[PDB]
């Protein structure tokens, strides 16, 4: 029914985003991004990083209906990668691995969205998001 179109579209989007996020969170390369940085083990993390983000929080935000478009979702993936580059110094090999992995996460997420979402469906999501 036409009156159910908005809800049906967003449900489809959320299902897709939840699948994408699960694919990222279970990828061994991105394990360090799968849960919030432990603010007690990394005692200076919140001093440096104003808006923490991680893949488990992205799942929650999907379920809280925070994302109306794939671009909305990608902003938080980009934040996860941005946080890693802002926080971690480029000193030791462990730092370099995390920083590289953050960029790989970003590239991988953007590539999945570009490959698996119909541009026409995205216009529909934008139209819905533009009506609210």
């Amino acid at each position: 029914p036409l009156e159910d179109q908005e809800e049906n579209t967003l449900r489809e989007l959320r299902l897709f985003l939840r699948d994408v996020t699960k694919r990222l969170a279970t990828d061994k390369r991105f394990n360090i991004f799968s849960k919030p940085v432990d603010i007690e083990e990394v005692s200076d993390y919140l001093e440096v990083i104003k808006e923490p983000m991680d893949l488990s929080t992205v799942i929650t935000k999907i379920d809280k209906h925070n994302y109306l478009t794939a671009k909305d979702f990608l902003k938080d993936i980009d934040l996860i990668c941005s946080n890693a580059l802002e926080y971690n110094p480029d000193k030791d090999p462990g730092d370099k691995i995390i920083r590289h992995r953050a960029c790989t996460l970003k590239d991988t997420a953007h590539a999945i969205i570009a490959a698996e979402l119909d541009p026409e469906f995205n216009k529909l999501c934008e139209e819905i998001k533009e009506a609210r």
Partner: peptide
């Protein structure tokens, strides 16, 4: 940047 995680 912070101290890092190493």
């Amino acid at each position: 940047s912070g101290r890092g995680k190493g």
